[PDB]
Amino acid sequence: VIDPSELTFVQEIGSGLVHLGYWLNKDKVAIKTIMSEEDFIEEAEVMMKLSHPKLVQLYGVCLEQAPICLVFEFMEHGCLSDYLRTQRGLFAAETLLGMCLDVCEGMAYLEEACVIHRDLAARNCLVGENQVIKVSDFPVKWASPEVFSFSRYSSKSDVWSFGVLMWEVFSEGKIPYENRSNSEVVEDISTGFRLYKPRLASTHVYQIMNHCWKERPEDRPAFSRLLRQLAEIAESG
Amino acid sequence: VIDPSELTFVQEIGSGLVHLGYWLNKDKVAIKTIMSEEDFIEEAEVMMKLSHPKLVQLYGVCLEQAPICLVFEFMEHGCLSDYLRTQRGLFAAETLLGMCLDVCEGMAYLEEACVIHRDLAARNCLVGENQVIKVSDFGMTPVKWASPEVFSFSRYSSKSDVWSFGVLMWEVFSEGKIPYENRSNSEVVEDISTGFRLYKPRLASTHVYQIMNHCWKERPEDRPAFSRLLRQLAEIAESG
Ligand SMILES: CN(C)Cc1ccc([C@H]2C[C@@H]2C(=O)Nc2nc3ccc(-c4cccnc4)cc3s2)cc1
Numbered sequence: 001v002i003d004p005s006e007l008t009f010v011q012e013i014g015s016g017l018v019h020l021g022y023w024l025n026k027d028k029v030a031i032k033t034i035m036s037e038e039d040f041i042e043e044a045e046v047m048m049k050l051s052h053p054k055l056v057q058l059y060g061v062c063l064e065q066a067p068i069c070l071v072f073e074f075m076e077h078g079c080l081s082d083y084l085r086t087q088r089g090l091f092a093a094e095t096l097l098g099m100c101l102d103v104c105e106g107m108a109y110l111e112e113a114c115v116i117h118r119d120l121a122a123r124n125c126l127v128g129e130n131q132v133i134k135v136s137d138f139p140v141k142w143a144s145p146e147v148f149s150f151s152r153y154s155s156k157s158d159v160w161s162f163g164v165l166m167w168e169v170f171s172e173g174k175i176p177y178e179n180r181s182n183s184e185v186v187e188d189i190s191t192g193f194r195l196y197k198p199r200l201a202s203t204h205v206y207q208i209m210n211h212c213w214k215e216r217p218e219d220r221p222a223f224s225r226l227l228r229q230l231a232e233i234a235e236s237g
Numbered sequence: 238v239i240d241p242s243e244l245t246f247v248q249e250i251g252s253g254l255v256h257l258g259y260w261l262n263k264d265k266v267a268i269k270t271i272m273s274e275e276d277f278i279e280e281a282e283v284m285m286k287l288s289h290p291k292l293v294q295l296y297g298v299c300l301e302q303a304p305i306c307l308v309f310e311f312m313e314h315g316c317l318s319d320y321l322r323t324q325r326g327l328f329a330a331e332t333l334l335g336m337c338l339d340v341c342e343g344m345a346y347l348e349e350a351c352v353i354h355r356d357l358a359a360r361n362c363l364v365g366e367n368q369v370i371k372v373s374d375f376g377m378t379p380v381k382w383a384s385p386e387v388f389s390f391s392r393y394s395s396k397s398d399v400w401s402f403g404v405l406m407w408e409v410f411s412e413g414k415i416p417y418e419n420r421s422n423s424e425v426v427e428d429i430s431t432g433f434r435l436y437k438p439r440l441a442s443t444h445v446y447q448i449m450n451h452c453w454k455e456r457p458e459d460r461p462a463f464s465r466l467l468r469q470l471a472e473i474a475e476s477g
């Protein structure tokens with residue numbers, strides 16, 4: 001890759017001849033437009049510290065009035081939900097398990113950092129360079145019994161949502177509980193109904209989804225446990 | 238952090254709403270100034286393919302004539318050699334081992350990439366963000382870092398780079414002291430051929446000195462590979 005002259009020389013540093021300079025380059029970013037000015041600088045700085053290759057990075061904020069904004073890393077292929085739907089019938093099960101592995105890697109970091117996503121779904125996940133999936137944006141169809149009944153959020157409630165996300169991936173973006181009302185989803189899950197097994201998902205994969213969908217959160221596997229299991233299936237293939 | 242208006246809006250992508258935009262940020266770079274144009278566009282692309290957190294990245298090249306130049310990632314604390322000397326008596330053994338580990342990661346990647354540095358030394362390594370060490374000046378195209386097959390037959394391999402690494406370790410652990418300080422090239426060649434090795438630095442442990450000696454085995458086939466050295470150096474770091 002070649003540079004024209006967006007290079008600014010400053011001073012010598014080396015002794016061949018080296019220089020300290022600036023490289024003012026146009027980087028593609030995603031800008032989200034939007035009380036408590038001081039708190040939002042801290043809130044962004046806290047989110048900025050949550051760095052991981054499988055999480056969409058927030059570069060900064062703009063507070064110089066007018067429509068105020070958040071600066072994020074640009075994901076070249078948009079959201080996972082749309083990426084799956086527009087490519088339906090062209091996926092290999094390997095690609096789909098890879099997508100789930102990326103999400104789990106990011107989630108295993110969030111679990112370790114003690115951060116509850118609260119709303120993990122394919123619409124909240126984005127597709128980047130060479131189909132890499134990154135987690136972003138931190139709803140009853142992705143809710144666990146403790147969450148839709150009591151709003152009892154934890155990493156284990158994010159584990160349930162990941163079970164739903166996995167199904168969304170292996171079903172190539174199908175709508176979970178397609179024609180079901182908020183009350184009907186609650187009734188169905190309570191009565192013991194679980195999402196069907198997609199053809200692209202193996203018996204071991206569907207077993208993992210069902211483990212994420214266990215009634216009591218303490219019966220569900222943590223993301224660190226899920227990461228090691230999915231990493232093994234990925235490499236053994 | 239805060240951004241003012243170094244933001245350029247382009248198009249709507251979201252529906253809160255999201256926009257595709259460009260961000261013009263002032264990135265600190267190191268510019269090295271200088272065989273047809275075509276060949277050096279390819280060589281710059283090949284060197285750009287060699288990406289690792291422990292190697293100084295080449296961002297690109299400038300070919301719009303006048304003095305032609307190469308643009309690298311800037312390293313805020315300069316070269317290792319000078320950083321060791323200017324901070325002597327202020328290093329913990331853990332920091333020095335941490336420095337050797339950094340070089341080892343970068344070198345193990347170059348080893349696997351089938352790339353031979355040919356001139357590994359503290360003078361070529363650079364210090365960055367929170368004392369991180371990164372290898373530099375490998376594909377840019379002395380007896381003290383040279384292995385016996387290199388000073389005898391010029392047999393350069395990843396194994397000869399391991400010898401340079403053992404000497405680099407000595408430079409690190411001796412806080413930038415000159416190896417074979419008052420020894421002529423003829424003196425160095427002779428001494429190493431008889432079996433004499435660099436003495437153990439004060440801050441280097443017994444286990445660390447064994448590592449350094451394995452890097453200094455007469456035969457390259459007896460020296461440990463960077464992959465083996467990494468696992469061993471990482472193990473020492475995680476425990477003690
Ligand atoms: C030339 N090329 C730039 C044209 C082009 C235009 C539009 C798109 C669309 C598909 C891509 C897209 O939607 N990218 C996005 N990236 C991000 C990153 C972060 C956030 C984000 C994160 C957190 C909160 N809110 C938004 C949203 C998006 S949409 C691709 C290429």
Ligand SMILES: CN(C)Cc1ccc([C@H]2C[C@@H]2C(=O)Nc2nc3ccc(-c4cccnc4)cc3s2)cc1
Nearest residue numbers: 013018020267269309310311312313314315373374
């Ligand atoms: C903010 N600023 C005003 C303070 C400041 C400026 C300069 C330095 C000097 C010490 C640092 C330095 O020497 N950095 C270097 N970085 C590189 C990166 C690549 C190469 C390089 C690599 C391969 C081939 N040629 C050159 C040389 C250097 S020197 C420290 C603080």
